[PDB]
Amino acid sequence: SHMRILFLSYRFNSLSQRLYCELTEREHEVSVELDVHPDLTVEAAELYKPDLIIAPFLKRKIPQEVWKKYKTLIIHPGPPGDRGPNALDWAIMKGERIWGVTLLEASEEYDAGDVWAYRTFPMRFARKASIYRNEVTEGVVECVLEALENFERGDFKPTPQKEHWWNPKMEQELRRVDWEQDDTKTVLRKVYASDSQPGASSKVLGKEVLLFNAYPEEELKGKPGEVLALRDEAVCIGTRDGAVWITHMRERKKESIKLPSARVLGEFLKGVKEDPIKPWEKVDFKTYREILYEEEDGIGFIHFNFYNGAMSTEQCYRLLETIKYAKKRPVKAIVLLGSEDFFSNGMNLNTIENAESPADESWRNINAIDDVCEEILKTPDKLTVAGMQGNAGFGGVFLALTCDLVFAREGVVLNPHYKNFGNLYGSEFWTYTLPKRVGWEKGKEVMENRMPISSKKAFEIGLIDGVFGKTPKEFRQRLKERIKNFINSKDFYEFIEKKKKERTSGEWLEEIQKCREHELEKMKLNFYGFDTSYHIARYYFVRRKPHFRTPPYLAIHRRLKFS
Template sequence: MRILLLAHSFNSLTQRLWVELSERGHDVSCEFDVNDAVTIQAVELARPDVVIAPFLKRAIPEAVWKNHLCLVVHPGPVGDRGPAALDWAILEGKESWGVTVLQAKAEMDAGPVWASRSFPLRHASKSSLYRNEVADAAVSAVLEALEKTEGARPAATTWKPAMKQADRAIRWNQDDTATVLAKIRSADGTPGLLDEIGAKPVYLHDAHAANGLSGPPGSLIAQSGGAVARATVDGAVWIGHLRAREEHALKLPALAVLGPLELPETPGYHDIWYDERHGVGYLHFPFVNGAMSTERCERLREAFLAAAQRPTKVIVLMGGPDFWSNGIHLCTIETAASPAAESWCNINAMNDLCRDIITCGSHLTIAAMQGNAGAGGVFMALAADLVLARDAVVLNPHYKGMGNLYGSEYWTYLLPRRCGEDKAREVVEARLPVGTAEAERLGLIDSHFGTTVAEFRTLVEQTAEAHAADPTLDERLIAKRLARAADEAAKPLDSYRAEELEHMKLNFYGFDPSYHVARYNFIHKVPKSRTPLYLARHRRK
């Protein structure tokens, strides 16, 4: 079936549908909905059997939906209508929610329903729910809709308007912790919840309950790992990240936005932790947006080296439930006094971490990808001995989309040994998302399993403990050290790194500003003026 994905941008849900539909043999192309004329032209060129709209910010042109079957993915249950479905569901404390696939008609979100799915509404941020439960439900519903030949009758609907900041404004002298968390999570990650801290207007992100803390409602009472704790009427919340209400301001750790504060340092907020069970060490690093700044790389490297000193034989690198890693931190780079210099520091810190994982001869290392991974994060995973991924994970194993960035993290060593030289070059040049089935065929991962994060974690633990109990593990570790020594003799890791960094130096400091322009456009969400040809396959014909 010829399918045209019509989307505002190539976001996580659009990527997931691209992967799932392509894996099932459909001829998939994508067009960014820039304006009516572009969309109409795209449909004329693609001649699709169906147009699927997973992420739009405006109505599909009448000339398109009147003449073609257009299925809209709405992140709400049957009957829900409006542009802020998930925001309202979180704010109103719904226990369950859903996704509806409906046919585009003149009235927004009111066409015939073709398929729907429901799920329990987990206590989490909007962006986390969108990447996980919403994406899973959307894929299932879209696949059902594609199997049907005619739609159902329109259902009774309830319109919900776009959510305003006033709808979720925090009343610190009245709201309890659960209410504050729901309000912040309903806006996280876009646009964030507008508030004030010390008369400074800021958007709040990355909120968690601060168990055991309390104080005058609304006051800042503690700090931990770059986060600040703010009191509610019955406790407190950690606020990990803020974005100043200023032009071009970016989401950064709270203390980086507020500056140094005279607050007590209190344990409670952490983005790296280690636990150990049955001879296996588990290293967690659920960094916001999977972004790894210089400082985060250095702290994670210290944690990994400490884990390698433990009397265990297996280390599992867990990442986080939303992202495993997306490589260098573009926001901290953008806000640095010299973005080029900070890019250089960041990539070297990533390389130092990757090198320690590659050369760890004392343990079997496992990368357990609970969530998506991109760019250098994918290649950091390949530094481990075994790479496991949850079924629904999407990988973007390339750098080219960021202004033709060459990339490092020893990918020129890690990727060919897994995929072969020809496939390695094909992977980094493709610029396309890769699902776990394709990733396993390519050799990027060793196995994929688990529908939910909880199921995946359970199976990872069983796998890791089985390796730890394997009586031949010591022999396997000896073989690992010998293989690494042979590779080092053939070509030292330092040589791979130096060659990669020569290219990266040109990206960061050279005359071509493509990387700096692409980084700026990406983090400031500047809409693309056209769809790249590697996505708009209909425009290549």
């Protein structure tokens, strides 16, 4: 019953990773072939001889030689009968109330194969990536697990499609924001449909840009197209009936880097005044709040919505300032909540690559995230909690591990490792937090593993302290009630008493410092030494360069001892 399954994916993306966790933790073997060349895909399937092929994310046709020989099921992020490469883009642009996902059989015509499973769900008015990572992903997991059981059953007959419609690749002219003609709702719809790829084209201050990560603004009312304000490198732009914040942009050029808006517009933003809102301020209206601090029931909650989970050096210092604020408050616990889509993905590779010296900026960024980690660790008189509502990878996983307690939503995927990105040693005090949780033996195994793990697996191995809730909202409510009941028990004051004794002693203070300097010694060699694999890997990743090989940690079939 344990199947051998081959994934065909354009990239090993969030959906591919989630499915990888769901299948392998059910004791199926999953090998991945990235979509490099049809000839390579033919070879992959003849080497691996899968029981079943699943294509979670693919942008071109599987060759007939493969799907006529091996049963091949393709994910489509739309309901049955929807066909085309940009299903979610069109669903958002058209304002569809209900949407869905479909698992269909490979065929010669795009998205025309018989249906193995499907789920429908109501749409949210939200970024494409948010729909993809939540509703679409959860529905795909259900369809794939259902198709697996039906495949093992042996007698299954898929349903041919009846009604169908085709939506082609959406052109940039359809996404383009015209500030004079588009009200705020229209700007949001266009950016949402284009986020995180490929962006909504527009002209801001006479510059051709692509827009990402929009938020309505209800106070600042200016003139259509006028850059009204700057807040944490996001810009606020007047629309037909109001204003919208745009936090990130990209020059309308090949292989340009997605960056905070202020680093793209740059010289054209002289005279635009910063308009700050401290995270702890209460505000009556809709606006962009990168970081939000709220106190409830003796708990201080810190939301930090860093686009794509990437924490630039400057974002790290803004988070650090909010943590220091919270530590002076009369709360018994501080909870780091990240955002709904990500807890954290560690250093911001985009702002590093864009820096005059990416090596220097790497150094600044890793010291800044370590300063956040050290501030959390040196909190002897309050409980600290990491609540991972969404995925965490790289330095962001070990950020969470500096908190006393780590909890995650069901279905969150963790990448507690670096080795994919030119073998960084990592820091964030992992040489202290990881052995304390799972020991050194199991600790090195965790960081040697280059594949994702679910929050359920992380809990089973003792990497985190609990997993609960199906949605961000349900996770936050359960987390709050769990912490509330703990900080009002006797074991809280007993826990804090032991934490005070330990984290005020010089021996603990000394051990922590030695951990940081050892990790940063290794990291400095990653950044400045003869090996430049980190810099090369960074260049390809941030500029969306295509894959030319599937590495052996993904492709079981491309390993040496294979038969």
